[model samples]
Target: ELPTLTPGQYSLVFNMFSFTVATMTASFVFFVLARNNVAPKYRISMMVSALVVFIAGYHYFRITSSWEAAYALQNGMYQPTGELFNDAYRYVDWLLTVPLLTVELVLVMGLPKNERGPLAAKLGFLAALMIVLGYPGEVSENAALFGTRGLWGFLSTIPFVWILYILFTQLGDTIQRQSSRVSTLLGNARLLLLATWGFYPIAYMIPMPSNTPGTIVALQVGYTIADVLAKAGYGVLIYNIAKAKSEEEGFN
Candidate 1:
């Protein structure tokens, strides 16, 4: 059955749009700044950040439109258009972007190709699988973590754990080779990834009293916040590391 959202809930759709605009603007500025300020070698890192912005910016527009089509404001109230509104837009966005996001972070570190190539390949693949596997649970009508739909989410967690394991162990060794300053910066970025990503599972299984509009709103808002922190905010960290490394390496 298609869900209905009240006027109050409808307002959240607007909030999502506003937030999308704000983050997209931030992404654009970062893209431009990356192009103008960052040098050639480091420029690639900024380009990675730019790609995040591009993908996210495009997805937010689609998400907002999806919400609009699902509900309409009429007579000072919101009503559904009875269309089969698909809220799976975020999953589509993640499917394409998450892998790139992981690769960008790994690339920015500028590790030796011998180390970086395989590390990037493995982690990137895991990240993609994690996103793809999670989609079924996310769109599931069943909310229980072990229910028919819930099984997919659990299946996805397997790859997620692997990603974490590799990051902390193998990737840890790679980071340790950097200078103290670079190592410290990379460490924070790694922690940030864990913290932000940690929210998704919680959001995924967030027990809604009845999966009401309020719960849906909460889930979307939470997801949006996580997205901003993970991509837009995380991109800033990438920029900083690039700048720091450029200075440390005497890159022009």
Candidate 2:
């Protein structure tokens, strides 16, 4: 089994590197929330998002465990260790983004100054529900279908749509605000998110998901790359997160 992977698949270790990087970002976020007395409303969502990113690391580990199986194998599910590892992590990456994105949107929109109502909160909760349902689907073995892997994708859409709305609104706000930081940070987040979200569209366009193992690898890589950039390259925003004032107080 160790002898099976092609060079192309082997090169994808970079993806693992990316996922590990995302894990670190998750920890960074968790720490930020702890240091600041972030509003009570966001605390739970922040912790939950951080947990999603950190826990997803385990899925990647399982995949790396069977490097040989994933290396040369074509895209698609198999009962073997490699495929299981691959699918599990891919779903992990998907869930990390889709669900938390929804949660993050709720936090952003719920920032007090915004006139939005409980509807956003209800939507965020719905996003969480999708995670609950789809998670099993994303991680399942080949025999499980959605119960095994299909459900997560379907459920993940809830958060995906919610976050996209928040993102669009944030982008629009950029023009009206005087501070460059907000737009700068939002653009950075949007760019990273667009790259990460592309995984879904790609998965849909390419039928026979079980046949192509590489899709999982690509998702992980995307996860890792987006995270690293969001955390490090986008350092200004994360730093500003510390110095900035929260709208919760309605004052400077």
Candidate 3:
């Protein structure tokens, strides 16, 4: 059921997956080591960042192994070995990490106790819903505008948009209330999340225009790139915010 790939294409995705695993693993170590550098209140956000990449790193490991199992080098190119490629591993990883990703943003912001609980709850719920809705469409073979895939993608966008709205508008006051330096970093972090997440739907829809082996490679590699930036890159921003806030409160 998987596309046949030339050696170059196969290696490209393999290398991307391998790189992502390394990135996530390295990020996990950094987050863990730096946990105590931030104030205790912000420490949970650091822990969650570490958890996000740890989960992602493990799933990428599964994905890399699955990719190896699904293809065999034959003659000069890689051919499907009839084993399932199981891209579902990414979905599962997203299901767990996406909620945490959003929740960690709320956590790091250090909102009021009442505000933090409810806001994080809402964001986590919506994030999970977005991922859950997208999965059915992602695995659906239909690529037509009104096909099952498109329908599910459309449904998923609802929650995705809502999440963005909350990030941009609802959090607007809080983001601005920070010290100028922290505010700028928070703004960039929000934009980083938006920009990285914006790639997912594009990658998802690539096959709609043309479902070729090259497109398959593009989809896989594109997702890997997005995940690395979203999880590891975003984690760095989260750490910076925590550090800046801790110093602002004279914890340094």
Candidate 4:
């Protein structure tokens, strides 16, 4: 079910994939180098952030290569080459990274030992559930309102909302204990996570009513934009929170 794409559409998606790989790779290097700047306690969070972007970079590299392999320039347009573009690479990347993303946020918070472990575990579980539930919907060809795609998407949102609820309400007391600067950054980090993740469902539903070439391009490009922001951008925010907390604790 590959779409025949105009040169412009093809190049747009191609350039976005190329751009994301570069962004994720560069972010990975930056997070790794900056890890030593944070306190020893916060170093692991930085390293995890680095790992998130590195995995994303590697996956995007595979995705970009797959995109190239899946299409051919023919008769003045890009046509499918009988090779499928493997969108599943994204799910594989998400399964590994999304749990880390949630757990790293909890880790960087420096929550009490008793609180942190259980909270991280809960978040990791919910994040994994969210991805797993969403995959069936993502691969569903039927876009009817009551179809498998809609059902799974609806199911996935339950965990997604629960994650946000826990982050905002259950963590409220901990957030209140932070220094003003650190507290502000943590609030923004949570908001940024929400904002970036919010784009995903929109992109996921874009072609539900009509799976045209235009919608396909929009979906792919929309996903690339969301991934860059959610992973690389969010990783930098995680680093900032770690650095802020480290400095507040008297570390340079």
Winner of 2 and 3 under TM-score:
3
lDDT of each: 0.78, 0.49, 0.90, 0.87
| Candidate 3: 10-residue stretch with minimal lDDT | 203-212
Candidate 4, residue 26: the lDDT equals 93
Best by lDDT: 3
Give the local distance difference test score of model 2: 0.49
State the lDDT at 10 in candidate 1.
Answer: 80
> Taking the tens digit of each residue's C-alpha lDDT, what string does model 1 give over 1-252?
345667777887668767886787778686767765655677776776787777888888877777777777778677778765566767787887778778878877768777777877888899999998887777677777568557887899899889888778866556888888888888888889999989987777666264567767777788888888888888888888877888877766
lDDT of 2 by residue, 1-252 (tens): 223334455566645664564565566575445534555444554454455545545554555565545444356322334443344455445445454554444443324446344545555566556556655544455534334354556556666666566556643643235245544554555566566555553453343245444655564565556544443333333333323434424423
* Candidate 3 C-alpha lDDT tens digits along 1-252: 787889999999999999898988999999999999999989999999999999999999999999999999999988899998887899999999999999888987857788999998999999999999998897787776579988998999999999999999887778888889999988988999999999988777766635479778877877888888899999999999999999989996
Any runs in candidate 3 off by more than 4 Å, and if so which? Answer: 209-211
For all the candidates, what are their Cα RMSDs to the real structure? 2.1, 7.0, 1.4, 1.4
**Candidate 2 Cα errors over 4 Å, as ranges:** 1-3, 14-34, 37-49, 66-86, 108-110, 113-120, 126-163, 166-178, 208-239, 246-252
- Worst 10-residue lDDT window for candidate 1 reads 203-212
Cα displacement (angstroms), candidate 4, residue 201, comes to 2.3
lDDT of 1: 0.78
